[PDB]
Structures are given as C-alpha cells and as structure tokens.
C-alpha cells in the first residue's frame with residue numbers, strides 16, 4: 001500500500017508537500033466527535049462546557065509521549081473514560097484497537113446528548129487514526145473521504161504505519177461491501 005499511503009499523505013499535506021500542526025487545541029471533526037490534545041483532556045471545566053460525556057485517551061501511558069490519565073481523573077465530572085496504551089510509531093499496531101474504539105464512539109453517540117473527545121498528546125496521529133477508522137467501519141466512508149473530512153476540520157498527520165493500517169482496513173471493508181461509493 002505504499003502508493004495509497006502516499007496518496008493519503010497528499011491529502012494531508014498542502015500542495016507543497018508540507019504538514020501543518022493543529023491550529024487549535026480541540027476541533028469537532030464530525031457531529032459530536034471531537035479530536036484534541038492533552039491540555040483539553042486534562043481541563044475538566046473546558047470539557048464540561050463543550051458538553052463532553054465520553055473521553056477516549058488514545059495515548060494512555062507514563063512517558064513524555066503519553067497522557068497519564070485514568071477513569072479516576074474523571075470520576076467527579078461523570079465523564080466516561082476509555083484508555084488505549086498506544087505508541088505513536090510506525091510499528092505500533094493500532095488496528096488491533098479499531099473495533100474497541102469504534103464501539104466506544106458508538107456507545108457515546110447512541111445517547112442523544114453524547115459527545116466524545118478522542119485525544120492523544122497533540123491530537124495529530126493516534127487519535128485521528130481511531131476517528132477515521134470509526135468513520136470507515138461505522139459510517140461506511142472510504143478512507144479517502146474519511147481522512148479528508150477529518151483533515152478539513154483539524155490539521156492531522158497519522159504516521160505512515162497508521163496510514164498503511166487504514167489502507168488495509170479500507171481494502172477489507174471494500175471487499176465485504178461495507179463502503180458507500
């Protein structure tokens with residue numbers, strides 16, 4: 001999938017081939033789904049104002065490359081938490097979590113007042129990958145349309161390994177007849 005990954009890179013970059021970082025801490029990328037950074041995840045007052053009911057930490061961990069939070073952190077607010085201990089590297093198999101994350105997003109949106117924040121450290125690689133996978137798996141969007149819609153609403157940049165994982169997901173869903181044209 002080296003070309004399909006390059007094709008996805010061309011959709012992320014500007015036309016000069018360069019990659020921009022997020023211009024804001026948090027964005028609603030599709031209705032009731034937000035992608036953001038560590039600071040928004042750790043600002044409970046901000047979360048309550050946005051009306052976030054569910055937080056999916058896609059970078060849970062203890063290092064400087066992780067966000068060191070847990071369900072306890074959110075007990076007082078009544079926010080429902082899910083953590084995934086992922087690393088932002090080309091070899092980390094985030095695809096093993098796609099079903100779990102999609103189920104959690106579905107759980108959040110199944111309540112009419114539900115709003116989910118999917119976040120990582122910068123809201124740039126780990127978290128957008130999960131949202132894109134969700135859109136493909138649960139809203140029948142092909143990878144190009146899903147990545148494009150997220151990228152229109154937030155500067156994102158999944159690493160090439162994550163992008164290769166999304167391409168393999170796309171091939172499987174296509175063949176199973178689960179993608180809209």
Ligand SMILES: O=C(O)C(=O)NCc1ccc(F)cc1F
Pocket residue numbers: 021059088120121122123124125126127
């Ligand atoms: O998966 C993530 O958390 C993620 O967003 N990684 C990108 C990133 C992390 C740290 C940094 F200083 C600059 C970055 F662009």
